[PDB]
Each structure stands twice: as structure tokens, then as C-alpha cells.
Amino acid sequence: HEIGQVPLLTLEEEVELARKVEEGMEAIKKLSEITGLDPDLIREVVRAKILGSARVRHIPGLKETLDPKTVEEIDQKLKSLPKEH
């Protein structure tokens, strides 16, 4: 019943999401270059804010404990970028 509450994608919608995901990974790659931050750490911080306050936990491969202190710092450092970055 719960899966039947998410409608199936249109050919257009499928491509849009797939497209946005590819572009999004590419964005994270660039944010790594600009900032010098581990691509995974950036990815987990981005992902943290999307899913919401609900899910915040330590991620294995990452060197730093992932907690609201670090995600605010890292998100605030990302928002410290110039408009084109």
C-alpha cells in the first residue's frame, strides 16, 4: 500500500530526475574542487539537509563525526561561496 502512494514516472519525469541527479553529482564534484572538501563529506551534508533533521548520523568512510555542529559549519561554509560558485 505505501509504494502505491508514489505514482509511477512519465518518460519526461524519469529523464528530468535522472538528469538532475547526474548534474547534482557533477555539482558536488565541483564543490569539492572549489572548497577542497572531501566529495563524500559534501555529499553527506547536502543529503543531510534534503532528508531533514530526521536523519543525522555518523557515516563510516567519513573521517569526521557527522553532527549538527559539523553540518552547520560545512553548510555555512558552502553558503559562504560567491553567487556563481
Binding site: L11, E12, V15, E16, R19
Partner: protein, 157 residues
């Protein structure tokens, strides 16, 4: 659908008693009122490039490929020539019958007028939009918002 901005300068000749003097014509505005039908005639010899808008038309005479004249036919003026037609100085291009006005989609900014005999020749500075349609396929995304302003080379889809 991209409505492209075209700003040009095209001429027209009308009787003198039949035309209403204004410095500009808003679209739909009455340009002249003819007591009897009038034949607008060629002032150059050339091959005809006919460009028809929704209402109203543009007409362009060329020798070689170089345009020698640019004429504007407002509403109430029916082209008597077809694209690629050879014309000689003095042959009627369009008949103008009754009330002729600016078309609904096209304007007249500045209007200069010279008077010769019983006619006036208007040198019109005209601005109008020509629509072109593009079909967007499922694997394509439109990267431009509704009402955006684009120059040559800007990506739409």
C-alpha cells in the same frame, strides 16, 4: 514559441487628403481613410520578396540580392503580387480599400512624411515580433523561463 524582436524602416505612399497625420500609430490605430480604392504602386523595379504577418504585410524589392526598397502594407491593403514576382516601376503592388489601420501585432514608432504632388510618402520606423515554433522532445529540457529575454546564441532548449 519565440517572438523575435525586429526593428526596421519601411515606406508607404498614400493620397494626402486620405491620411491622418500622427507621429506614431498604435496597433489597430486608423492610418488613413480612402474615399475610393487606391492602388499602391512600385517606385522601383525588382523581384518581390513577400513577407506576410498575421495581419498586414511587408514587401521587399531586390536587384541582385541587394534590397532596393522596403514597403509596408497595413490592414485594408491586399497584395496584388506574389512572392518572387518581377515588377517594373509604376505597377500596382497592393489595393487599399476603405479604412486602413496598423495591424494588431505591429506598431509605428517615429513617422517622417514627405509630400509630392497629391500624395505623401511615409518613411516608417517599425517594430514588430515574428513568431517561430519549436517542438520539444521528451529527452530535452527547456532551460529558459516564460517571458525571458534572449539575444542571438542564447540556449532555449
Amino acid at each position: 514559441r519565440v517572438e523575435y524582436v525586429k526593428k526596421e524602416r519601411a515606406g508607404l505612399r498614400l493620397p494626402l487628403a486620405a491620411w491622418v497625420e500622427k507621429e506614431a500609430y498604435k496597433p489597430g490605430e486608423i492610418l488613413a481613410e480612402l474615399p475610393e480604392p487606391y492602388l499602391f504602386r512600385a517606385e522601383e523595379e525588382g523581384v518581390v520578396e513577400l513577407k506576410e504577418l498575421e495581419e498586414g504585410a511587408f514587401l521587399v524589392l531586390r536587384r541582385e540580392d541587394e534590397p532596393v526598397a522596403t514597403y509596408f502594407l497595413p490592414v485594408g491593403m491586399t497584395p496584388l503580387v506574389v512572392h518572387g514576382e518581377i515588377v517594373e516601376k509604376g505597377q500596382p503592388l497592393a489595393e487599399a480599400k476603405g479604412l486602413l489601420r496598423m495591424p494588431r501585432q505591429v506598431r509605428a514608432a517615429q513617422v517622417e512624411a514627405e509630400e509630392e504632388g497629391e500624395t505623401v510618402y511615409l518613411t516608417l520606423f517599425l517594430e514588430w515580433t515574428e513568431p517561430k515554433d519549436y517542438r520539444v522532445q521528451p529527452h530535452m529540457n527547456v532551460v529558459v523561463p516564460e517571458g525571458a529575454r534572449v539575444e542571438a546564441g542564447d540556449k532555449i532548449v
